[PDB]
Amino acid sequence: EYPTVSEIPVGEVRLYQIADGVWSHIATQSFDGAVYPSNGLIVRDGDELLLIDTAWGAKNTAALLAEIEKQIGLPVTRAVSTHFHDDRVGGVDVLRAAGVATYASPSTRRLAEVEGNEIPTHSLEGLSSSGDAVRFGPVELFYPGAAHSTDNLVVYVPSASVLYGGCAIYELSRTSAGNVADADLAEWPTSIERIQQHYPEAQFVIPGHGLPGGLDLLKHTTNVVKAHTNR
Ligand SMILES: COc1ccc(Cc2sc(N)nc2C(=O)O)cc1
Ligand SMILES: [Zn+2]
Ligand SMILES: [Zn+2]
Numbered sequence: 001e002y003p004t005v006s007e008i009p010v011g012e013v014r015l016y017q018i019a020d021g022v023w024s025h026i027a028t029q030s031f032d033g034a035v036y037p038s039n040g041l042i043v044r045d046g047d048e049l050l051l052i053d054t055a056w057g058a059k060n061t062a063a064l065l066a067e068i069e070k071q072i073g074l075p076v077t078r079a080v081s082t083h084f085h086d087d088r089v090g091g092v093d094v095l096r097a098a099g100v101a102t103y104a105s106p107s108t109r110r111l112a113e114v115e116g117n118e119i120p121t122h123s124l125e126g127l128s129s130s131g132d133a134v135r136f137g138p139v140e141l142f143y144p145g146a147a148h149s150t151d152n153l154v155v156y157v158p159s160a161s162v163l164y165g166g167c168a169i170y171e172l173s174r175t176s177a178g179n180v181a182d183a184d185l186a187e188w189p190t191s192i193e194r195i196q197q198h199y200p201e202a203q204f205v206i207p208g209h210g211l212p213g214g215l216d217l218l219k220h221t222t223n224v225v226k227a228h229t230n231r
Contacts, residue, residue, distance in 0.1 A: 021044030164205075165208060
């Protein structure tokens, strides 16, 4: 059974096996008063591991690396942040100190700079236009356009038909759009469709927060967006 926010004390991390050599990681952090859960991805990359997003903070991210070492036992060598918020780059400095090569789009890097957040080292070339995609070891990184934020990425894991939505895809239980400060509600519905388009095959879709699903998570998000465009 998937772990829920109330089962993960702040400072602990959980690994959850999705498919052969594909796990999610789950952690918890406070924000504007209140604690929320947050997801990321781990994909085997030959004899190494590829990290999709931090565990939302330095302490969580240290505990992630340690759980990884305890449960999987292969070194984490690269990480990719999918947008510039703290649930995506918070802990990049720990990764860096651990010896992980960190990566992100050039726009994600500039925006973390402006926000005062931690900044990944390496720029991901080839992700500038709505619809671009590049192969990053065992995964495909894909830029569907603005949504939750202007830079936000999603990742697809070919060999397993896993699609990682990042904070661009809500979980069904979630019906309020929550914080959309840096959002473009206008393009957001189009970008989800850009996703559905490119990844029709996804058998498993993971939101940035909460419980995983199938392609239905795309449409549910859309509704919840539009229900807020209107009012
Ligand atoms: C699934 O339950 C929830 C409810 C609300 C939030 C608000 C936050 S905090 C954070 N670091 N990201 C978000 C987001 O919406 O992307 C996150 C998860
Ligand atoms: Zn965000
Ligand atoms: Zn988020």
